[PDB]
Design an enzyme around this catalytic site. Structure first.
Site, PDB file in Angstrom:
ATOM      1  N   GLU A   1     105.387  -0.448  52.525  1.00 51.96           N
ATOM      2  CA  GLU A   1     105.402   1.012  52.346  1.00 51.96           C
ATOM      3  C   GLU A   1     104.503   1.442  51.169  1.00 51.96           C
ATOM      4  O   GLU A   1     104.533   0.810  50.110  1.00 51.96           O
ATOM      5  CB  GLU A   1     106.831   1.564  52.174  1.00 51.96           C
TER       6      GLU A   1
ATOM      7  N   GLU B   1     119.260   1.563  49.840  1.00 50.58           N
ATOM      8  CA  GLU B   1     118.494   0.817  50.832  1.00 50.58           C
ATOM      9  C   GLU B   1     119.344   0.590  52.076  1.00 50.58           C
ATOM     10  O   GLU B   1     118.831   0.622  53.169  1.00 50.58           O
ATOM     11  CB  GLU B   1     117.981  -0.523  50.335  1.00 50.58           C
TER      12      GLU B   1
ATOM     13  N   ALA C   1     113.337  -1.057  45.173  1.00 48.44           N
ATOM     14  CA  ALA C   1     113.724  -1.811  46.343  1.00 48.44           C
ATOM     15  C   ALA C   1     113.123  -1.170  47.640  1.00 48.44           C
ATOM     16  O   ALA C   1     112.722   0.000  47.658  1.00 48.44           O
ATOM     17  CB  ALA C   1     115.237  -1.904  46.418  1.00 48.44           C
ATOM     18  N   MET C   2     113.043  -1.970  48.701  1.00 51.37           N
ATOM     19  CA  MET C   2     112.433  -1.562  49.937  1.00 51.37           C
ATOM     20  C   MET C   2     113.379  -1.823  51.122  1.00 51.37           C
ATOM     21  O   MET C   2     113.912  -2.957  51.279  1.00 51.37           O
ATOM     22  CB  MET C   2     111.132  -2.325  50.095  1.00 51.37           C
TER      23      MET C   2
ATOM     24  N   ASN D   1     113.366  -2.738  54.136  1.00 52.27           N
ATOM     25  CA  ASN D   1     112.794  -3.398  55.320  1.00 52.27           C
ATOM     26  C   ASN D   1     113.904  -3.816  56.250  1.00 52.27           C
ATOM     27  O   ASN D   1     114.915  -4.344  55.793  1.00 52.27           O
ATOM     28  CB  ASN D   1     111.953  -4.625  54.968  1.00 52.27           C
TER      29      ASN D   1
HETATM   30  N1  LIG Z   1     111.329   3.148  50.399  1.00 51.10           N
HETATM   31  C1  LIG Z   1     111.860   2.666  49.074  1.00 51.10           C
HETATM   32  C2  LIG Z   1     110.949   2.959  47.846  1.00 51.10           C
HETATM   33  C3  LIG Z   1     109.576   2.310  47.850  1.00 51.10           C
HETATM   34  C4  LIG Z   1     108.445   3.017  48.294  1.00 51.10           C
HETATM   35  C5  LIG Z   1     107.159   2.491  48.222  1.00 51.10           C
HETATM   36  C6  LIG Z   1     106.978   1.250  47.686  1.00 51.10           C
HETATM   37  C7  LIG Z   1     108.082   0.531  47.209  1.00 51.10           C
HETATM   38  C8  LIG Z   1     109.374   1.061  47.281  1.00 51.10           C
HETATM   39  C9  LIG Z   1     113.128   3.424  48.767  1.00 51.10           C
HETATM   40  O1  LIG Z   1     113.138   4.642  48.932  1.00 51.10           O
HETATM   41  O2  LIG Z   1     114.073   2.848  48.251  1.00 51.10           O
HETATM   42 NA    NA Z   2     107.562  -5.480  53.063  1.00 50.64          NA
HETATM   43 ZN   LIG Z   3     114.462   5.601  49.722  1.00 51.12          ZN
END
Ligand SMILES: N[C@@H](Cc1ccccc1)C(=O)O
Ligand code: NA
Ligand SMILES: [Zn+2]
Ligand code: NA
Ligand code: NA
Length: 866
Positions: free
Chosen positions: A117, A294, A258-259, A261
């Site tokens: 992301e 997450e 954090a991500m 996935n």
């Molecule tokens: N999508 C993740 C944040 C994120 C975005 C881009 C890079 C890394 C982390 C969240 O909202 O928790």
């Molecule tokens: Na990833």
């Molecule tokens: Zn988020």
């Protein structure tokens, strides 16, 4: 770099339905084979444009035929003359060890991991890297067995094999279609904490939490929080996990928190690892928040995703609201509401006045990582909360149900979500939609009148939104404005107009309008904008006595805290002006009395008391002024603490001793007493010096947990106590080998009020526990200096700015995302005085002149200089 506009969104000319990836992994050279089933929707003369950054293309096949009709530009592989249906095969190479930006596939200590992301998948192979393309992934990983015994990707592990020469492979399959930003891969050696969770309908989910070897004793909390998140999402929202396994990997090298996935969350280890002597209450509660966040993304972001990145808040506002609710359901809702409002007023309002100001749904973006903001996340959440406020819980859940019924398995827009709320509830949010398209903080002015002849209270509410740098046109918003009227005994006066009840959340939809309430049997003390019912600045001419009255009598604890904030605001402004004339602090006695009363209220919840006895941050105080004097503000916060410490010294000490706790628990009562106790210690550190030094040194040494030891260490630094250097030295000698724990130390150094703080910070670039290769380390020393020590960052001589510019010259090449986070204090120049402004502009002009200026900084610098 080129700007992209929301109004140019078009459905893609091609779709991919399925992709089979093979990774032959090596840190120097990883080979990627990507086999993608695609479909042309657009016209036959329209080529396939694949996004791609820093890739070494090896071959291109179409239905196994070596393909000759392609070219490479310029982030892109352009493929011509394709059929309506075909199999694309790309082989390309990449190099994880070289990836200092931590975007795509990179190296975290000894492990390899991904961050995709928003647009990081394009650093792994040529793809349609845009979240409206969903496909079913399967992922085969080949690697060295010894160096990489665990090989993880999204979904279920469906195949596995050994090879000659020390190599093995695993294959994963994720049956749920997804945008590539949700792809993930991890390889390395770990200790694994394994547990299970059984869903309300009986599905047994294996939970697996991967951490560096040695750290299994810091994982149980995170595991407990995951289970709690899963349970809460069932109870509150009716939502269950959809897979057989949930993986979480903690890594030390990560740009964000954090991500989400799918099935394989990758976490900055700062939001996983906790042990009572390394971690604080705040850490524990953050770990809970981020694990929840997450996890909640599994529905609000994954099962329904974003049609394009301009729709980020569709999942972030909503998913943040979700973590707030979860935190609030499990803990103190008031304390949660309070801190989140500090963040809104203290930090978000600043962004909505800055040159980076944008609506929660942006209309233009140059670099999308710059839009992971307070605005999109936090204000995004306030906007969801306003929908909650206008609909009520029942209808809100019906909207959720309709949102998912309509959009599960697809990519939606902000508008789609709003339509589902409207349709399920029958509330018109037609005008409400404007919150999504309009930037800046509305200002709500309130004027009232009591008429004793008629027993009527009249409110005349008006709203304006000042122009922002991004938008010259602003219109009225649909503002949910919650009120309560108090009589002279503190009893709530029923709201009504000729005979019939009136809902206390008013609909302020106009530039100006008037509301009349009947049967107001006594001149009321009003509570305005309750629970922060809209994200606005409130203008109303309170007396101090109205505010102290609310601090005793208001029914919601938020209102009592907030009334105390309005009491303080007036005197913060007074005393900044006084500081500017070299005069000492002036504070009427009834202010100090109000705070004495809270310290001695036997019946008040210690958590509320502690928030009330927490003075607004410098960043909060800053929002009270057109032009900021960071030195006056910092010096006044100190003086105010000294004065209260002095007035209240006995009460402070009494409350401090009474709240002592032998046992350490992470439990909301215990956290509350401890937060109050440490609030007290803080004032005391600024009191009589010998007593301050004894209390603080004793606490640091006796403490059986990091919350108590750090509050002390931190007070020693803030108040410049005699014992400070020793305690700091001790902490270093004990904790130097632990980066996450040292962050706390680096933050204290970076935020010290000492005269020579910059000099120390510079020296700390050589500290054993510091490295520029680690964002957490960078953020805790450099970022904390520039963002969180505004008195030193804005020294009259400009040394703060030069320091940052030197650091940013490094990071712009190394890690543009961390660089862009760090630049933010500098693009606020228009809030400071002219001389400061000149130096800051000079600094921005320096940075604009770098070769290989990153898009990430370019966007901010050009806006800040406009
Ligand atoms: N999508 C993740 C944040 C994120 C975005 C881009 C890079 C890394 C982390 C969240 O909202 O928790
Ligand atoms: Na990833
Ligand atoms: Zn988020
Ligand atoms: Na697709
Ligand atoms: Na609660």
């Amino acid at each position: 770099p080129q700007a992209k506009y929301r109004h140019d969104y078009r459905a893609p000319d091609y779709q991919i339905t399925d992709i089979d990836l093979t990774f032959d992994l090596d840190a120097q050279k990883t080979v990627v084979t990507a086999v993608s089933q695609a479909v042309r929707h657009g016209a036959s003369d329209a080529p396939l444009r694949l996004n791609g950054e820093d890739l070494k293309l090896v071959s291109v096949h179409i239905n196994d035929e070596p393909w000759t009709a392609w070219k490479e530009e310029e982030g892109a592989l352009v493929i011509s003359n394709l059929p309506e249906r075909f199999t694309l095969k790309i082989i390309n190479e990449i190099s994880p060890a070289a990836n200092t930006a931590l975007e795509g596939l990179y190296q975290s200590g000894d492990a390899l991991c991904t961050q995709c992301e928003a647009e990081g998948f394009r650093h792994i192979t040529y793809y349609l890297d845009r979240p409206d393309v969903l496909a079913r992934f399967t992922t085969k990983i080949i690697a060295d067995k010894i160096k990489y015994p665990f090989l993880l990707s999204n979904g279920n592990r469906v195949a596995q094999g050994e090879l000659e020469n020390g190599r093995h492979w695993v294959q994963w399959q994720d049956p749920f279609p997804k945008p590539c930003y949700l792809f993930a891969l991890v390889a390395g050696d770990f200790d694994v904490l394994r547990d299970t969770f059984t869903t309300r309908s009986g599905r047994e989910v294996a939970l697996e939490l991967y951490v560096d070897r040695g750290n299994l004793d810091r994982a149980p909390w995170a595991m407990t929080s995951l289970k709690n998140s899963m349970k809460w999402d069932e109870e509150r929202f009716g939502l269950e996990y959809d897979l057989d396994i949930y993986m979480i990997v903690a890594v030390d090298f990560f740009n964000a928190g954090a991500m989400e996935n799918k099935g394989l969350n990758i976490f900055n280890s700062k939001y996983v690892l906790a042990r009572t002597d390394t971690a604080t209450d705040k850490d524990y509660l953050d770990i809970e928040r981020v694990i929840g966040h997450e996890y909640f993304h599994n529905w609000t972001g994954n099962r329904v995703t974003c049609r394009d990145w301009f729709q980020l808040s569709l999942k972030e506002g909503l998913t943040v609201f979700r973590d707030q609710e979860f935190s609030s359901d499990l803990g103190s809702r008031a304390v949660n509401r309070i801190n989140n409002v500090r963040t809104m007023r203290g930090l978000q309002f600043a962004e909505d006045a800055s040159p980076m100001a944008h609506p929660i749904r942006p209309d233009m973006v140059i670099e999308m990582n710059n839009f992971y903001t307070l605005t999109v996340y936090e204000k995004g959440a306030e906007v969801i909360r306003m929908i909650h406020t206008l609909l009520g819980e029942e209808n809100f859940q019906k909207g959720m149900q309709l949102y998912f019924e309509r959009h599960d398995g697809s990519a939606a827009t902000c508008d789609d979500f709003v339509q589902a709320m409207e349709d399920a509830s029958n509330v018109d949010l037609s005008h409400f939609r404007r919150w999504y398209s309009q930037s800046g903080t509305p200002i709500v002015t309130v004027k009232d009148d009591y008429n004793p002849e008629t027993e009527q209270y009249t409110l005349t509410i008006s709203q304006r939104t000042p122009a922002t740098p991004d938008q010259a046109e602003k219109q009225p918003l649909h503002i949910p404005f919650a009120i309560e009227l108090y009589d002279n005994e503190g009893k709530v006066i029923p709201l009504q107009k000729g005979g019939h009840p009136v809902n206390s959340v008013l609909n302020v939809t106009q530039a100006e309008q008037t509301f009349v309430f009947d049967n107001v049997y006594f001149q009321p003390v009003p509570a305005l904008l309750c629970e922060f019912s809209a994200p606005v600045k409130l203008e109303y001419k309170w007396s101090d006595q109205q505010l102290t009255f609310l601090m005793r009598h208001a029914r919601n604890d938020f209102s009592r805290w907030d009334a105390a904030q309005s009491l303080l605001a007036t005197y913060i402004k007074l005393n900044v002006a006084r500081h500017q004339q070299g005069q000492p602090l002036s504070l009427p006695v009834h202010v100090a009395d109000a705070f004495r009363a809270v310290l001695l209220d036997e019946k008040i919840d210690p958590a509320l008391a502690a928030e009330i006895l927490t003075l607004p941050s410098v960043n909060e105080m800053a929002e009270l002024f057109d032009i900021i004097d960071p030195i006056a503000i910092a010096e006044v916060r100190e003086a105010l603490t000294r004065t209260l410490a002095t007035e209240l010294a006995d009460e402070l000490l009494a409350i401090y001793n009474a709240n002592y706790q032998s046992e350490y628990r992470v439990e909301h009562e215990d956290i509350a007493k401890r937060t109050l106790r440490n609030a007290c210690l803080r004032f005391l550190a600024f009191g009589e010096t010998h007593l301050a030094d004894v209390l603080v040194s004793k606490q640091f040494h006796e403490a059986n947990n990091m919350t108590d030891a750090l509050a002390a260490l931190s007070a020693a630094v803030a108040a410049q106590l005699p014992c400070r250097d020793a305690l700091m030295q001790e902490y270093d000698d004990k904790w130097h080998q632990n980066g996450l724990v040292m962050d706390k130390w680096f933050i204290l150094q970076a935020t010290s009020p000492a005269a020579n703080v910059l000099e120390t910070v510079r020296g700390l670039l050589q500290h054993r526990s510091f490295t520029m290769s680690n964002p957490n380390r960078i953020r805790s020393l450099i970022g904390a200096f520039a963002g969180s020590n505004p008195a030193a960052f804005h020294a009259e001589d400009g040394s703060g700015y030069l320091f940052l510019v030197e650091m940013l010259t490094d990071l712009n090449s190394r890690n543009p995302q961390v660089a862009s986070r760090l630049i933010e204090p500098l693009i606020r120049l228009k809030r400071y005085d002219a001389k400061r402004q000149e130096k800051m502009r000079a600094a921005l002009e320096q940075l604009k002149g770098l070769e290989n200026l990153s898009g990430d900084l370019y966007e901010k610098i050009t806006k800040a200089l406009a």
